């Protein structure tokens with residue numbers, strides 16, 4: 001996260017850090033608890049991942065330093081990638097991880113609500129992006145989970161900023177005209193969480209963009225409301 005601040009422990013209890021153990025253990029991508037056996041994340045995170053056996057999901061984490069060889073984690077039983085996914089920039093950048101055991105919910109870890117189809121007309125004014133990603137284009141994974149408040153931008157506005165791409169209605173964009181606050185490398189797969197009528201909704205999944213926090217280059221997110229049928233289908 002560029003231009004963000006350290007999170008409070010437990011304030012983003014749906015946020016997970018997905019690790020790979022190969023060749024040695026490291027943070028791979030963000031994701032969101034959406035059900036007791038289910039993490040929603042980006043499809044592009046699994047480029048070259050051959051098997052779910054190399055993955056570890058850690059929940060209830062604030063600091064990456066909490067994670068050591070003796071720290072408990074959730075195994076991944078299955079990776080489910082949208083069958084129309086080819087790459088982040090063309091959409092369908094969404095994936096489910098089916099965990100090998102179920103998450104026991106607590107103040108430190110619990111699921112985020114998916115948006116309703118009735119909320120397509122909602123004007124979210126309180127949206128946040130979170131993660132352990134870079135604080136600038138050339139940087140490293142951060143110890144402490146970062147957060148930034150970022151306003152949504154209209155698709156028509158977003159399309160003007162990415163003339164070489166097609167910004168579809170299955171995408172949603174967010175950014176300051178002047179830049180300065182954004183997701184960056186290592187944040188991908190994580191949530192764009194919006195608070196509306198005192199409830200947090202998983203509005204986006206961090207997907208792609210040009211550089212990080214550049215002026216007139218908003219972040220592009222998978223538009224989660226357009227996938228509620230797919231999520232239901234794939235999780236039932």
Ligand SMILES: NC(N)=NCCCCCNC(=O)[C@H](Cc1ccccc1)NC(=O)c1ccc2[nH]c(=O)cc(O)c2c1
Pocket residue numbers: 026027028029044045046047133140141182183184185186187188206207208209210211212213217218219220
């Ligand atoms: N909103 C804006 N402006 N851009 C949107 C930002 C989201 C895309 C950025 N890419 C990303 O976030 C890659 C996506 C990716 C993941 C896995 C494999 C390939 C690509 N992530 C990374 O480049 C990435 C992921 C995990 C990492 N772990 C480490 O220990 C060190 C790293 O340098 C590192 C880098």
